[PDB]
Amino acid sequence: MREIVHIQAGQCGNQIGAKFWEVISDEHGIDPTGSYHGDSDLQLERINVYYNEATGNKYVPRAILVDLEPGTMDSVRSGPFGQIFRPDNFVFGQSGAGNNWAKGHYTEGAELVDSVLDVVRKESESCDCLQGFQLTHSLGGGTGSGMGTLLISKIREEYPDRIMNTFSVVPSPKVSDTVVEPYNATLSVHQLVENTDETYCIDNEALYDICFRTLKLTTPTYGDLNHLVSATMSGVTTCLRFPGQLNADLRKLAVNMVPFPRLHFFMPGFAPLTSQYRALTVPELTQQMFDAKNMMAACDPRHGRYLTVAAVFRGRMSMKEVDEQMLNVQNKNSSYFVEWIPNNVKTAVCDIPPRGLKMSATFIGNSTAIQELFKRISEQFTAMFRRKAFLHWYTGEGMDEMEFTEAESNMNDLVSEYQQYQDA
Amino acid sequence: KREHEREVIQKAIEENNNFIKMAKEKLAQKMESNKENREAHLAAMLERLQEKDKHAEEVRKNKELKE
Numbered sequence: 001m002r003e004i005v006h007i008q009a010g011q012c013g014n015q016i017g018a019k020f021w022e023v024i025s026d027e028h029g030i031d032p033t034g035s036y037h038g039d040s041d042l043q044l045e046r047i048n049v050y051y052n053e054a055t056g057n058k059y060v061p062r063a064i065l066v067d068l069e070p071g072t073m074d075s076v077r078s079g080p081f082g083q084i085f086r087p088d089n090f091v092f093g094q095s096g097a098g099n100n101w102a103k104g105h106y107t108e109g110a111e112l113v114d115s116v117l118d119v120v121r122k123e124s125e126s127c128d129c130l131q132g133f134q135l136t137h138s139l140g141g142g143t144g145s146g147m148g149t150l151l152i153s154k155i156r157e158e159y160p161d162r163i164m165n166t167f168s169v170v171p172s173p174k175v176s177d178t179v180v181e182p183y184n185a186t187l188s189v190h191q192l193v194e195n196t197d198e199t200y201c202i203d204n205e206a207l208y209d210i211c212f213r214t215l216k217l218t219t220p221t222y223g224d225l226n227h228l229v230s231a232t233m234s235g236v237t238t239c240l241r242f243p244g245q246l247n248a249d250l251r252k253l254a255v256n257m258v259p260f261p262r263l264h265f266f267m268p269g270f271a272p273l274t275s276q277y278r279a280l281t282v283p284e285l286t287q288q289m290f291d292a293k294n295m296m297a298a299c300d301p302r303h304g305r306y307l308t309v310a311a312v313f314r315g316r317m318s319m320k321e322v323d324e325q326m327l328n329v330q331n332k333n334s335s336y337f338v339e340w341i342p343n344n345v346k347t348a349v350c351d352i353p354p355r356g357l358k359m360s361a362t363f364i365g366n367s368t369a370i371q372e373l374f375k376r377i378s379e380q381f382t383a384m385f386r387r388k389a390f391l392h393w394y395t396g397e398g399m400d401e402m403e404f405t406e407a408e409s410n411m412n413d414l415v416s417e418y419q420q421y422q423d424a
Numbered sequence: 425k426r427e428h429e430r431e432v433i434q435k436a437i438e439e440n441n442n443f444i445k446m447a448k449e450k451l452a453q454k455m456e457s458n459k460e461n462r463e464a465h466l467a468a469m470l471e472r473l474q475e476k477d478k479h480a481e482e483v484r485k486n487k488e489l490k491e
């Protein structure tokens with residue numbers, strides 16, 4: 001099991017996805033046209049996880065670009081690393097999704113979904129041993145939310161035994177396109193609970209506050225929000241992309257991180273937070289990555305308990321001092337880690353650091369506090385839904401009010417389920 | 425879920441079509457009811473003017489038939 005197939009859905013999906021590929025191509029020494037111009041053999045030793053090798057020794061990403069309008073995917077092609085993606089893997093409709101789940105899932109997206117899966121199959125067929133799939137998308141809009149969750153269901157039908165990861169940008173009024181986002185998010189969450197093994201909850205509320213408060217950016221763009229995401233995305237995928245001895249796959253992570261199948265909603269963190277000259281000591285990275293300020297999902301981890309943690313330190317450092325520091329926060333704050341899962345924090349180290357920093361730390365937490373994020377969207381949903389506000393946009397595409405009442409209830413059970421183990 | 429996906433898009437077509445149908449018919453009802461009403465008005469106007477002619481024939485005979 002080596003190969004991962006990547007899909008990126010809609011505006012946000014394709015935007016953060018582009019940056020993920022820009023970031024990791026740089027770490028692997030792969031230039032904008034697809035040729036390798038690095039130095040180490042360690043850059044190429046697990047390049048087959050995210051790249052196909054082409055004629056004339058070009059490296060092309062195993063990446064499929066999906067949208068219901070040509071806007072964003074045109075910008076990706078014009079953008080800095082656009083010439084590397086296989087042009088056949090640009091699959092786009094024309095009419096758009098209008099920030100409407102129904103359009104993405106049931107009508108406009110239904111028309112395009114088969115043509116997307118053909119390319120998925122095309123990239124899968126030439127995988128020595130396909131391990132799984134990862135999707136970048138948002139739950140607030142139409143395409144990424146609706147069509148993204150449809151593709152997830154189609155991919156599961158056709159490849160029911162592979163791993164399905166998502167990097168899912170959860171919405172927020174602080175960084176809002178449209179009032180209907182909580183509807184879209186809530187319909188998507190119900191899908192993700194069934195059809196994904198891991199879902200990385202990127203919350204736009206959190207990314208804003210990190211950009212605003214802890215980076216001193218007064219007026220942050222989506223660009224500033226996506227820097228944080230593409231750094232985090234490089235961080236969690238480090239151990240797949242590099243050697244070694246203590247090397248990794250998706251399924252073992254999914255197994256060890258997810259004690260109950262519906263509870264697979266992780267809370268990312270990164271340290272230090274960038275947009276520097278003093279390198280951080282190991283005790284600082286450990287303090288920072290566990291800080292609520294560094295979390296990408298706007299939840300206070302003190303309001304719940306960790307079921308499992310996974311931590312990935314990058315850089316040349318004392319593995320003695322990492323162990324010692326990781327054992328310090330566990331032994332000094334043991335009330336916030338469940339007692340009934342022994343040794344539930346796993347640490348890995350990787351010698352290659354990311355562009356800019358001499359040593360970093362990425363944090364993956366399956367905390368019960370993540371219920372707060374779903375409670376927030378569940379409140380935003382009901383304020384509107386209790387007056388059937390804005391439903392005409394969805395019922396016009398064939399949707400029923402029953403489907404909304406279901407998706408509401410499924411997510412309120414998810415919050416109950418997370419609350420259950422926060423007390424036990 | 426696959427049969428539900430088709431049930432939604434079939435319903436989306438059904439009501440889009442139904443809106444065209446009941447618009448198309450409601451408009452036909454009005455344009456026919458109107459044309460009936462407008463001609464009913466102009467027929468009664470002309471029938472009162474045709475009744476004036478028959479009275480003017482009684483007046484033109486009462487001159488002839490009173491000599």
Ligand SMILES: Nc1nc2c(ncn2[C@@H]2O[C@H](COP(=O)(O)OP(=O)(O)O)[C@@H](O)[C@H]2O)c(=O)[nH]1
Nearest residue numbers: 010011012015138140141142143144171175222
């Ligand atoms: N972090 C981040 N969020 C985004 C970006 N673009 C859109 N969003 C968020 O995603 C939601 C809208 O989804 P969008 O991707 O525009 O719609 P789609 O193209 O139909 O999937 C809103 O909650 C936006 O705040 C982006 O570049 N970065």
Ligand SMILES: CCOc1ccc(-c2cn(C)nc2-c2cc(OC)c(OC)c(OC)c2)cc1
Nearest residue numbers: 239248249252253256308309310311344346348
């Ligand atoms: C709560 C314990 O969580 C764990 C324990 C072990 C593993 C694991 C086992 N293998 C063979 N590989 C991993 C692993 C660990 C990671 O964390 C440092 C990974 O980074 C996210 C990883 O990447 C896929 C694999 C996993 C979780």
Ligand SMILES: [Ca+2]
Nearest residue numbers: 095107108111
């Ligand atoms: Ca169409």
Ligand SMILES: [Mg+2]
Nearest residue numbers: 011099141177
């Ligand atoms: Mg948008």
